[model samples]
Target: KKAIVDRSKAYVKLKSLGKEVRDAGYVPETKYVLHDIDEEAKEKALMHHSERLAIAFGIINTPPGTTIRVMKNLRICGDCHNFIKILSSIEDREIIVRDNKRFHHFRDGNCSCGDYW
Candidate 1:
């Protein structure tokens, strides 16, 4: 049987939403998952790696005080969970990540969920 890959339409939708939000006079930050390291190999690895990259890109692209909103298709890994917390704290910005199960609000080195993943 051939493996099936699910593309996240959320990325595109969120980008559009960000644009709309920005056009409405609010600075918006957005990121999309494009490629996986092992797409051909079909190996399951930590999803946080890509998330970190996306977060870094958002950081570089967005100005300070810009609110970053993320939407994910799957559950976030432990590393990403911790990494975003640090990013939110060090960057002093609010990051809202919506995963398959729930939403994670990261701010000031902490999360609204309190790391309950």
Candidate 2:
């Protein structure tokens, strides 16, 4: 299926990026940060950390009109929810977060779904 192919490709890309980082003589701060982890525990850990990092980087590095979309296979956590909301408000940027259920559009300290999402 298309999902399988996408995961395979992601695995390959992650492996290559790891190798490149190692070759550059920098051991990754978070070893499991970027990997195709299947274990539920590992996936949860990675998701939590990755979501924080993604939101932080997205807010800090994002330019106006440069949309960042995340395609996750699982649910988005509450911590990440709060993080994204604050980031949107502080940065004054629009963020469209599509998780497992619905799309959350955050802008101007308000969400399109009226904070119900």
Top candidate when judged by TM-score against the true structure = 1
lDDT of 1 by residue, 55-106 (tens): 5456555897887877888888765676567656556678888889888988
User: Using alpha carbons, what is the TM-score of model 2?
Assistant: 0.47
Q: Which stretches of candidate 1 lie over 4 Å from their true place?
A: 1-48
- Residues 10-114, model 2: lDDT tens digits: 555444433443454423233434556646545345334454444444544457666656555556655455445555655455777777777778665555666
Runs in model 2 deviating more than 4 A are 1-48, 59-65
RMSD value for candidate 2: 10.0
Candidate 1 lDDT score at position 50: 55
Candidate 2 — worst ten consecutive residues by lDDT sum?
21-30
How close to the true structure is residue 78 of candidate 2, measured as C-alpha lDDT? 54
Candidate 1 local lDDT, residue 2: 21
Query: Which candidate achieves the best lDDT against the true structure?
Result: 1
